[PDB]
Ligand binder design. Structure first.
Ligand SMILES: [Mg+2]
Ligand SMILES: [Mg+2]
Ligand SMILES: [Mg+2]
Ligand SMILES: [Mg+2]
Ligand SMILES: [Mg+2]
Ligand SMILES: [Mg+2]
Ligand SMILES: [Mg+2]
Ligand SMILES: [Mg+2]
Ligand SMILES: [Mg+2]
Lengths: 140, 117, 56, 110, 103
RNA sequence: CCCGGCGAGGGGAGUGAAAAAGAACCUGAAACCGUGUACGUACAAGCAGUGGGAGCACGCUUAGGCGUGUGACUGCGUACC
RNA sequence: GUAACGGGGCUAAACCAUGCACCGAAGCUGCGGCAGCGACGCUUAUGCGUUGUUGGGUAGGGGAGCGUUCUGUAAGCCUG
């Protein structure tokens, strides 16, 4: 018959907990981006709706390799003309890891709709274990 | 002494016009489609089926490189272990073992890991 | 401003989307257990309650 | 014919009239108006006329005085479309098909 | 236990599975002669002893069943330039079934 | 015979082998225009397909991994003369 | 309008040296099939199986055919 496993509409979701307190920073994104798609996954034919479910912790412990601790363009221009452009170096932004840096995965995903389905939907935080505002249940 | 083109006239247009998909607008309704589009279909088709043999291979290795490495030795080293054998050489394609017979596959990564001199 | 090939079918059949008509929905008002028209009281006599236009 | 009436020509296009028709089906009959008399679109004034003519055929072709009935069918078909020309950019963008339909109303038993 | 081998393509993924393959040689008809495959075996691969090789001791092969070696398939397949058309052609095989006992 | 303006137009009944032959009348295609149903579709960029492809609607078979429709998501990728 | 790594991003994901391994084309090999020529096996007008090899190429040359209208074979055959 037509081979292609269907799209059970994001059938299963395996929960996980990275550490981010590591030393890989930017390298980690890939195995973080591959995961929310169909990396470790075999069946659940990607391309179509899908994903997984992992979560970041502190993450505040990153340095990148070279002097990237001091670079990284970063600007979040707005629909305001009048000459805006908000450039802030990485360390300048690392003061409060928000929608960025830890969120380096967004630029690594299919982008637009559906990819957008995974997006921040992995949670980030910046303190590891304490009062996990996130779902405490099953994780690895 | 009668061309009376009408006679095959119809059959020809109807033939190509027979593009079920309809595609879009003039691409079915108007004869204009045929050698413009029905022809493209033939062209785009001509290359994709044969160019596809690799597009899947690129996927096959894309997953082997993603499966075998997680348990030591990258895809680069993998086939190299595997490479050494008298009969041990079963190609990829079935290489998707990582999806159904993980135990086999990881039991196959040793066939290479421990194999690499 | 000339055009060149145009698909009568499909296309246009799409612009027609923004062309369907619409429905009202209004009351009868206390007296007329029906008409009342739209936000009016009633045309039968054109009265909201008495001597307005023509009534008792 | 199980009391019909239908139409032909007049001119009011298909989809135009096919819209108002959907409004009336199922119950209908006693709905000779209101679900029609309270909707103004040309298509409406046309379906009602034939609606009544149809419900009227309930005193001639068959019995069953007007009160029961159902109106289990209402469908409009494309009727021959008139052709005309239209002066425009020297004569290129001109086709104009007037289009027309009917209604074909029915009234059977539930 | 799983299965594995080549012979005209690595077609031996499925365990026993009874799937088509190639053809004997002199003739096809059915019956059998009892042809063990070879130790291409994934060690059979199937038990607490899934093994990288397949090589898990000498001699390990399954006997061929020889279920049904016939049939064909037909596929038009016709090319044509702008002045010709080899359009008219056909080449097929029968791929003998074979059920294959246990590993 | 019945609706209607003693309209137009139609619905029955009857003629007929047929009116799915009613005078617009043989056969009646295409463009073009509609009603109905299955699926897709209101955060997504481009010759609109092609390759891959899940889901859904039906159809499968004493499963056996399929047929028809539709096609989310995705690699490609600027009509013909 | 980044626009002098294709982008990402890189302190080595740069370079230099050394070596192994892997990816990678219609190249080669494997398997099946087509056609021309030389051979081989025979068979032997001949022909077929094995084999070596040759088969990118608009103008253009050569060679085979389809399907259509009409004629013979046809008051034969098919058909209310
Ligand atoms: Mg002609
Ligand atoms: Mg795949
Ligand atoms: Mg008028
Ligand atoms: Mg012009
Ligand atoms: Mg729907
Ligand atoms: Mg089919
Ligand atoms: Mg353009
Ligand atoms: Mg290759
Ligand atoms: Mg030919």
């Amino acid at each position: 018959m037509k081979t292609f496993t269907a799209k059970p509409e994001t059938v299963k979701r395996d929960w996980y907990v990275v550490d981010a307190t590591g030393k890989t920073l930017g390298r980690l994104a890939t195995e973080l981006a591959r995961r929310l798609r169909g990396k470790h996954k075999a069946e659940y034919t990607p391309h179509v709706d899908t994903g997984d479910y992992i979560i970041v912790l502190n993450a505040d412990k990153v340095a990148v390799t070279g002097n990237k601790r001091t670079d990284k363009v970063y600007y979040h221009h707005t629909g305001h003309i009048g000459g805006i452009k908000q450039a802030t170096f990485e360390e300048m932004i690392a003061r409060r890891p928000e929608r960025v840096i830890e969120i380096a995965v967004k630029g690594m995903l299919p982008k637009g709709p559906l990819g957008r389905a995974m997006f921040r939907k992995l949670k980030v935080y910046a303190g590891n274990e304490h009062n996990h505002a996130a779902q405490q249940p099953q994780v690895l | 002494a009668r061309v009376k083109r009408g006679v095959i006239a119809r059959a020809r247009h109807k033939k190509i016009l027979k593009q079920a998909k309809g595609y879009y607008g003039a691409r079915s309704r108007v004869y204009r489609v045929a050698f413009q589009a029905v022809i493209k279909a033939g062209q785009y088709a001509y290359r994709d089926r044969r160019q596809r043999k690799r597009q899947f291979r690129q996927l096959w290795i894309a997953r082997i490189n993603a499966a075998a490495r997680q348990n030591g030795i990258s895809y680069s080293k993998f086939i190299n272990g595997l490479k050494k054998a008298s009969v041990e050489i079963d190609r990829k394609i079935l290489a998707d073992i990582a999806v159904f017979d993980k135990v086999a596959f990881t039991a196959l990564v040793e066939k290479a890991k421990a194999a690499l001199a | 401003a000339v055009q060149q090939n145009k698909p009568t079918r499909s296309k246009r059949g799409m612009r027609r989307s923004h062309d369907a008509l619409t429905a009202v929905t209004s009351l009868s008002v206390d007296k007329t257990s029906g008409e009342k028209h739209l936000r009016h009281h009633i045309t039968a006599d054109g009265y909201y309650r008495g001597r307005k236009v023509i009534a008792k | 014919m199980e009391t019909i009436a239908k139409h032909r020509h007049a001119r009011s296009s298909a989809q135009k009239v096919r819209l108002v028709a959907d409004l009336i089906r199922g119950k209908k009959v006693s709905q000779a108006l209101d679900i029609l008399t309270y909707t103004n679109k040309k298509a409406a004034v046309l379906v009602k006329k034939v609606l009544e003519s149809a419900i009227a055929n309930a005193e001639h072709n068959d019995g069953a005085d007007i009160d029961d009935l159902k109106v289990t069918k209402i469908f409009v078909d494309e009727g021959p479309s008139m052709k005309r020309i239209m002066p425009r950019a020297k004569g290129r963008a001109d086709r104009i098909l007037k289009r027309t339909s009917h209604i074909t109303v029915v009234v059977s038993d539930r | 236990m799983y299965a594995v081998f080549q012979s005209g393509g690595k077609q031996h993924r499925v365990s026993e599975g009874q799937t088509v393959r190639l053809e004997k040689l002199d003739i096809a008809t059915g019956e059998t002669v009892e042809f063990a495959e070879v130790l291409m075996i994934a060690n059979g691969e199937e038990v607490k002893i899934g093994v990288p090789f397949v090589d898990g001791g000498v001699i390990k092969a399954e006997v061929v069943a020889h279920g049904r070696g016939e049939k064909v398939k037909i596929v038009k397949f016709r090319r044509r330039k702008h002045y010709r058309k080899q359009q008219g052609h056909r080449q097929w095989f029968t791929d003998v079934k074979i059920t294959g006992i246990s590993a």
